[PDB]
């Protein structure tokens, strides 16, 4: 209605789980908040530019812009930062892309990304960290980080089921607690804030299940489930009590020694997968000290997002990090990062990010060679410290470039 | 009644919110079970030796054993993890210290470290992290790290209020917050865990307090307050906004700019402190990348948990990491890692943790000469590389100790 569907360009099918992509699909994309004015351009360039190589002409992807956030109630009048049909159209055309968003306070609203993620159960909050060759880093070792983030998208305490202190529906169920459940461990009962925090079985093992079926997919070494469950024994030890028996129930999972841990034979080339587990406050630590160790990563909502967080800071990847979101039905790539206003439209931050999601979109639908031109492309940039500014501030004998420049310095170096 | 207090010896009193300590004062220590075995000899040793030296003979320790943990079943009969006249004692005697406690499972009891902290209403969980120089560390620059960090202890999701997945009483929560509250936000409400996250505005003004005093007391430059209060605005956001307000209208705090943040001027020193926030998965990003910018961190339970944890592993210092619990009645000050029984009895492992933790005690007993020698000691092992087995697997050219060696290294250098 306000969207312009491409006269040409085709619709990806989902045909009973496989996308069946055509030539010159319609990809969806929202341009993003902020610096989305920025990096966006550069996105739309290099991808066109590596599937214009990989395929010599004979693929073209039909760019449509649907509209979210702010600049949704400049197309679609002032109150409306969700529209209706972005959800049916990223429903409908399959995959689509994104850059940062802006949610307003002020409104009543919650978070315009996790409004996505549950509005169209997008439930796999996929995050790939790994070093690039090159970009300046905290810590002294960052080649030794390699890890794949299956951050669960939709219960946690990220549901967002709360209610004020000094509400009536406050008042409601803390009475309902303290009177009905009998609880006795709320220190200050008045002026009290509650949040819910769910975790279901169905919840855990869709989400596990994609974890180990990547493992096995990709010959990753292992798939480990952080969790805060011997303090959080009915959600946290739950999702690693039911992680660990869909492993042995679903994937023939076995005791390594006398347990905890499970051995999965990889079914294509043999090698074992092992199904471990940390405890969430421990492995922030061990990331860091012994990240060797660690490759598929497991967890819920929160923890997921701290981790991903954590791990791209430490690989000097901040600005560069990718991200998908993953359901049954639909998937939702996106710039990882603010919206940055402070700079937005002076063509300087980084467009890492939305680029490399949109390599892992490339790679959803099958586009290998057009993704692994993207990645080539990022690599050789990268390392001929050809960069935008905050790697630049960093590193000694770089080249400034601004945005679409780094764009065009991906380009050449396909 | 089966702890034996010391015929010599005299109790702290409290003198309204002051400490009156005398010279030979009583303190229960509660041994720790694993390495507790290890550990706490070399610590009682360490500072008995630095009162030994600090007052020449004229101050004396009466160290009395309580019991908790797997030891107090052995002493008090295998049913008993935590003993009533522990919490009595450690009220009574004012200030105890102690090792790695096991909490059991298969028993449906909760984790004693906790137990202790919620029953005794330590609701202040500090946690100081500085580098000492010379320790290896994962980071580029880890002398750039010198923060404290409070984190709340009485409430959030670590209250332990909560439902297992199947249960009449998950059953019946689940039924009231879908019926009657109305919720149409939990994606599966069958074979669902729920746990509660209670942040109330007494919980964290008592915290926040603790927190900006404590930048006065010691010129710290600022206070942030980290929280993902942008998600979870009703429990963090309250957090945030209760802070802000504490430093506005207990400490006179202004504006800086057109806010967020506030200056509050150190009514002893004429510095401004900055009272400032930051979102708890940004921050984790933040430490590694800019820790010079922040110094006194107040926090939520579990953020602050995984925060605490996270710097420790930065600096170098997972083993000598220490810890206090402080209520208004009495502190609890601690060894911060776990027992680990593979090494239990080998006197092999670090005990810089549990004897950090003890100058920490004795500075708060106000016996700073004898604590600035254990931190003298400290730095002058570690920099003479005469370190224990964790430290020495990772320098080149350093000499391997004992634990109760390092304690005689430690005393050498004092």
Redesign the interface.
């Known amino acids: 209605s306000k969207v312009v569907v491409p006269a040409q360009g085709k619709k990806i099918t989902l045909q009973n789980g496989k996308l069946n992509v055509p030539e010159n699909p319609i990809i969806p994309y929202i341009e993003g908040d902020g610096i989305g004015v920025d990096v966006t351009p550069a996105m739309l360039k290099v991808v066109d530019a590596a599937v214009e190589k990989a395929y010599k002409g004979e693929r073209k992807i039909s760019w449509m812009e649907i509209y979210t956030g702010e600049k949704s109630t400049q197309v679609y009048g002032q109150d409306v930062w969700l529209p209706a049909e972005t959800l049916d159209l990223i429903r409908e055309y399959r995959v689509a892309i994104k850059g940062p968003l802006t949610?307003p306070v002020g409104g009543g609203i919650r978070?315009l990304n996790?409004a996505l993620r549950?509005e169209l159960?997008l439930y796999i909050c996929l995050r790939p960290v790994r070093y690039y060759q090159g970009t300046p880093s905290?810590?002294?070792?960052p080649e030794l980080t390699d890890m794949v983030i299956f951050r669960e998208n939709?219960?946690d305490?990220?549901?967002?089921?709360?209610?004020?202190?000094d509400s009536a529906?406050?008042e409601?169920?803390?009475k309902?607690?303290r009177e009905?459940?009998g609880?006795k461990?709320?220190?200050?009962?008045?002026?009290?804030?509650?949040?819910?925090?769910?975790?279901?079985?169905?919840?855990t093992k869709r989400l596990v299940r994609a974890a180990i079926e990547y493992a096995i997919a990709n010959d990753r070494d292992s798939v480990t489930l952080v969790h805060?469950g011997?303090?959080?024994?009915?959600?946290e030890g739950?999702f690693k009590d039911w992680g660990y028996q869909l492993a042995r129930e679903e994937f023939g999972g076995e005791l390594i020694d006398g347990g905890p841990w499970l051995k999965v034979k990889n079914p294509n080339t043999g090698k074992e997968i092992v199904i471990k587990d940390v405890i969430?406050?421990?492995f922030?630590?061990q990331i860091?000290?012994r990240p060797a160790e660690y490759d598929v990563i497991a967890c819920m909502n929160?923890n997921g997002?701290?981790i991903s967080?954590?791990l791209?800071?430490?690989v000097g990847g901040?600005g560069i990090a990718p991200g998908a979101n993953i359901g049954d039905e639909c998937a939702l790539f996106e710039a990882t990062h603010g919206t940055a206003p402070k700079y937005a439209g002076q063509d300087k931050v980084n467009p890492g990010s939305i680029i490399l999601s949109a390599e892992m979109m490339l790679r959803h639908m099958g586009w290998t060679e057009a993704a692994d031109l993207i990645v080539k492309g990022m690599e050789g940039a990268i390392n001929a410290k050809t960069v935008t500014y905050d790697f630049e501030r960093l590193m000694d004998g770089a080249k400034l470039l601004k945005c679409s420049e780094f764009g065009d310095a991906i380009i050449e170096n396909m």
């Open positions: 949610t978070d996790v549950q159960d905290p810590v002294k070792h939709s219960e305490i990220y549901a967002g089921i709360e209610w004020k202190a529906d406050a409601k169920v803390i309902f607690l009905e459940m609880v461990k709320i220190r200050f009962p008045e002026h009290c804030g509650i949040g819910i925090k769910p975790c279901s079985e169905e919840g805060k011997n303090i959080m024994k009915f959600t739950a969430a406050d421990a922030l630590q860091l000290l929160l997002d701290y967080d954590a791209a800071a430490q901040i």
